[PDB]
Amino acid sequence: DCGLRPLFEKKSLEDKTERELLESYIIVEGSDAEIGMSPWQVMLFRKSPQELLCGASLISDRWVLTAAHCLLYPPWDKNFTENDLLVRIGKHSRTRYERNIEKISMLEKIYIHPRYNWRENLDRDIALMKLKKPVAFSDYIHPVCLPDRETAASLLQAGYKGRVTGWGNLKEGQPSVLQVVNLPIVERPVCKDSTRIRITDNMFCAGYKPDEGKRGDACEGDSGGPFVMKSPFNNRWYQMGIVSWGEGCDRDGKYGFYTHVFRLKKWIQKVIDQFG
Amino acid sequence: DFEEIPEAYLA
Ligand SMILES: CCNC(=O)COc1ccc(Cl)cc1CNC(=O)[C@@H]1CCCN1C(=O)[C@H](N)C1CCCCC1
Numbered sequence: 001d002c003g004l005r006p007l008f009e010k011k012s013l014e015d016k017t018e019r020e021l022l023e024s025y026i027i028v029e030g031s032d033a034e035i036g037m038s039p040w041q042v043m044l045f046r047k048s049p050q051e052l053l054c055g056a057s058l059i060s061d062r063w064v065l066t067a068a069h070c071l072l073y074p075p076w077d078k079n080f081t082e083n084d085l086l087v088r089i090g091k092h093s094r095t096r097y098e099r100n101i102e103k104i105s106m107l108e109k110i111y112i113h114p115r116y117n118w119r120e121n122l123d124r125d126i127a128l129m130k131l132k133k134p135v136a137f138s139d140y141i142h143p144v145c146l147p148d149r150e151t152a153a154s155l156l157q158a159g160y161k162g163r164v165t166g167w168g169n170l171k172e173g174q175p176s177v178l179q180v181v182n183l184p185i186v187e188r189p190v191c192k193d194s195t196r197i198r199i200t201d202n203m204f205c206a207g208y209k210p211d212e213g214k215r216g217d218a219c220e221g222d223s224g225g226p227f228v229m230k231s232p233f234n235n236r237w238y239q240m241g242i243v244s245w246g247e248g249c250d251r252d253g254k255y256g257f258y259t260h261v262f263r264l265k266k267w268i269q270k271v272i273d274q275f276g
Numbered sequence: 277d278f279e280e281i282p283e284a285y286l287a
Contacts, residue, residue, distance in 0.1 A: 104285040
């Protein structure tokens with residue numbers, strides 16, 4: 001049942017900008033999310049001090065996907081364990097405790113990819129979190145689908161637009177509510193030529209070219225969040241990427257880099273079936 | 277500026 005939103009697909013209602021995504025299949029400068037627009041959006045929250053750590057996503061009733069640097073990043077002396085965080089699902093407001101709406105979950109175990117490269121370019125920036133107890137879906141809580149080889153093959157194309165969401169910084173103030181931005185996938189060469197960092201096959205970049213007129217990008221706080229696409233084949237939402245890194249936010253000639261989820265699905269499957 | 281969440285989750 002993944003990828004079908006209770007307040008949209010299940011009711012046959014389209015969100016305000018999904019048409020822009022489907023039409024391309026030939027957070028800075030984003031807008032406020034609609035209620036129930038991204039029911040898989042998860043907020044990583046720190047108990048003490050109480051603060052937003054990162055974004056993340058719900059892929060089942062017991063598993064959450066996020067970027068590994070959200071938990072482990074030696075350069076900033078970051079190395080969180082299970083007891084340090086709470087997972088907040090069903091949220092809209094960044095700061096408010098949405099009583100009767102959001103659900104706060106506890107973590108059982110965290111799993112960081114064994115070959116996560118924090119020393120150089122955040123290669124394989126991915127981590128899975130097992131919740132203590134299953135979350136109950138609602139109109140505001142529902143998992144996103146993970147891509148299969150065919151869906152990845154057909155959708156992950158330069159020019160095709162994806163959607164990024166998060167409560168991160170608006171400029172390189174934090175938003176009141178969840179922000180959303182739709183960005184085009186960029187040609188590998190262009191991604192390569194815009195930075196000095198060595199790009200690997202486990203990443204893809206997205207954003208508009210300086211001449212495209214439109215702009216937008218993820219920023220601090222958006223990390224771990226999902227980059228999703230809606231399949232024009234089965235009308236389900238799939239997570240193709242994880243907000244990973246950038247050099248600044250919304251800088252001309254620069255692009256955001258995302259973890260290529262499909263390229264890492266074998267690790268994901270392995271972990272999930274191995275550890276329940 | 278985060279609102280006080282229930283202590284029942286903090287434990
Ligand atoms: C303004 C401070 N933030 C930034 O410059 C980048 O923030 C953005 C912009 C786009 C995207 Cl897709 C993701 C992020 C959030 N991610 C981060 O800030 C991660 C955390 C670890 C270091 N880091 C970076 O982006 C670093 N600036 C990169 C790390 C890899 C080498 C080149 C520098």
